[PDB]
Amino acid sequence: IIRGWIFGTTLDSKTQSLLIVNNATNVVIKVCEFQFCNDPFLDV
């Protein structure tokens, strides 16, 4: 059920954030000023 992590300061597009999404051992990684789902999850 655990499928990654968010890292940064404010975590809400006010700053650059490292996003890691995990598919057990495959990983997706990107570093934008993302706006996620505001109460975060992988959006299945």
Binding site: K14, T15, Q16, E33
Partner: protein, 49 residues
């Protein structure tokens, strides 16, 4: 007039740190609430080449 520097900061950068924040704040420490004015100098400033 485009070529730009943050003229002031609230701390020095870590080596190879990138910072694209854009907020007015201050040069110094006067209460300013994100509005320009005395001491409230926006650090993003540029050169007339």
């Amino acid at each position: 007039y485009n070529y730009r520097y943050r003229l002031f900061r609230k701390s020095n950068l870590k080596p190879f740190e990138r910072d694209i924040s854009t907020e007015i704040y201050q040069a110094g420490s006067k209460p300013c609430n994100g509005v320009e004015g005395f001491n409230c100098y926006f650090p993003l400033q540029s050169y007339g080449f």
